[PDB]
Amino acid sequence: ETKGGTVKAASGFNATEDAQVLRKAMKGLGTDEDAIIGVLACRNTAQRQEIRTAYKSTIGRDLLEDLKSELSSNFEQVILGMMTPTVLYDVQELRRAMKGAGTDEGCLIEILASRNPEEIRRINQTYQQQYGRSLEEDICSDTSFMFQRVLVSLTAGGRDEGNYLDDALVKQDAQDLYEAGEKRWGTDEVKFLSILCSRNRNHLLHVFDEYKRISQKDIEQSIKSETSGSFEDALLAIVKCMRNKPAYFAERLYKSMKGLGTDDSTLIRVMVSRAEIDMLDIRANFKRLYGKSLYSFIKGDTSGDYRKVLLILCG
Amino acid sequence: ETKGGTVKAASGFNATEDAQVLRKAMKGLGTDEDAIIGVLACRNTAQRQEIRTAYKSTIGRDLLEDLKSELSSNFEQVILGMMTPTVLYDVQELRRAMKGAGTDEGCLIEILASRNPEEIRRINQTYQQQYGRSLEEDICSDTSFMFQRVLVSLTAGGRDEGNYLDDALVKQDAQDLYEAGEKRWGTDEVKFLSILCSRNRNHLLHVFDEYKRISQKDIEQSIKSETSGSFEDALLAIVKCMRNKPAYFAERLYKSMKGLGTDDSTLIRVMVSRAEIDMLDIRANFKRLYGKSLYSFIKGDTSGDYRKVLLILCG
Ligand code: NA
Ligand code: NA
Ligand code: NA
Ligand code: NA
């Protein structure tokens, strides 16, 4: 296959025996990590929830608690992320990004620029239920000025939906972005915020093309020269997710691994969250952009059982 | 007229009185820029040298020094470029392109792809005499890998000259370019370098046509997809100068002015260096390519005495 996810529903699914295999893998000194991977990375997220249920009822134990106790470090993080329902995983990642003194702005941007409208609503509902604060409120206490405004707009949605295309308004929006940045002293960043957070995807694709026609620059090139900081990063992520969301994630993956070190938090979250959606597309775009396979990047930059499970999520 | 240069030798040429007019234009507070333009833009480069001689002997002053002291910014640059002998102007532009930490690769390409063999030899001789380094040596210290190799080949000449046309070798060169790029994994860039820097103009025109016949793509289209960076830009400039040098300069002019900003360095160098050679052809090709006049581009993108003198060089 060449598009869609890498992890699919397993055939012959037997949740009671999967639970047995996982218990045997952990019981006693030592762990059979290959069995844990060979079951869980070959079940989709829905099926992993059925295994959690069957493990409680037939093992009389808590599968997430046992996995947490038995596994450590990056391997634990991937397996626990894989075990978590989609909405709650995003909720937990947003909370972790804001918990305590720091802020993981890159995570906030990645999730809030890339999730679809219904996903965003579910995240808001579950975050508030779980923590007793709204996501918007936590974003406002962790961010300021224009960056706060873009993230709050992304949480509120309200972007025009659907695809109707008014050629005259496309032209005026492109002219207005040109006049708000490149053509003027300073940048009217509210105009950037307004157009990029309010227009529907189809309109914006047409605005980007027109912007290039009238300025000789890609809109990303003008966002980079005209804005800075986390606000710039947020605008770029919105543009990239509009143009080609799999290539946005391919870039996140490349930047998490290229050069010194690995940003494991980002590598893990992207691999877990996109495995069932568009990982095949992400792979194809990664190879197009970087002329190396995603598989070979993971293989070359990680090790151990962590590596083995990421390579299966990659396919 | 419709071909050749825009600036011609003036009739009634009186170098002593031209020198007087230029001195009066500058003497004292203020400058009569219209008189400076009205003399110098209406004399050819040879005649401007006779005015320099007459200014020393009858004014007892140095005309280039006075013009430098009195004029500023882009207007100064055009007037001083106009005052400089052809070979030395190219020499000074190549030196400026490499002086200090940066490199103006676009200037290196523009001059070295477009000048004729005897011009290139004169540039090499004068550059070494003036600076005590060879042009080749400075190009090698400022450029690397295949880009260095193409620029050094252009400086050495040695391209086959004349026009004899062997149909069988035309065919084999087109096949070899196809097999060295589009038909294969990777690109054999030495083969591109070899054919584009070694064959004579007439042969190459026949190779380009054949390349299109066998690949369905223009050679520029394959150079763009198969090569990158300054090496790509160099190959394209060589192809364009072989096909139609006035259209090459028309394109340089368009790109210097279209969209945000103006690349004054390129605009000035092209207007000064081509005024007496092929500016009428450049104008005709600019209009064909871009469906606007060159005059109207200059008028719309520059101002002041700078604009007035460029509009006269344009005709
Ligand atoms: Na925080
Ligand atoms: Na600006
Ligand atoms: Na240099
Ligand atoms: Na190739």
Short mmCIF file of C-alpha atoms and ligand atoms in Angstrom, two decimals, chain B residues 178-188 226, ligand 4:
data_model
loop_
_atom_site.label_atom_id
_atom_site.label_comp_id
_atom_site.label_asym_id
_atom_site.label_seq_id
_atom_site.Cartn_x
_atom_site.Cartn_y
_atom_site.Cartn_z
CA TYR B 178 19.42 12.18 -21.33
CA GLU B 179 21.23 9.09 -20.02
CA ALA B 180 23.28 11.23 -17.57
CA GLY B 181 20.23 12.77 -15.89
CA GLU B 182 16.58 11.99 -16.58
CA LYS B 183 17.12 8.35 -17.55
CA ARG B 184 19.23 7.36 -14.52
CA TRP B 185 19.37 7.43 -10.73
CA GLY B 186 21.34 10.54 -9.84
CA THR B 187 23.03 12.84 -12.32
CA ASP B 188 26.46 12.55 -13.97
CA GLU B 226 18.52 17.17 -12.31
NA NA C 4 18.63 11.27 -12.74
#
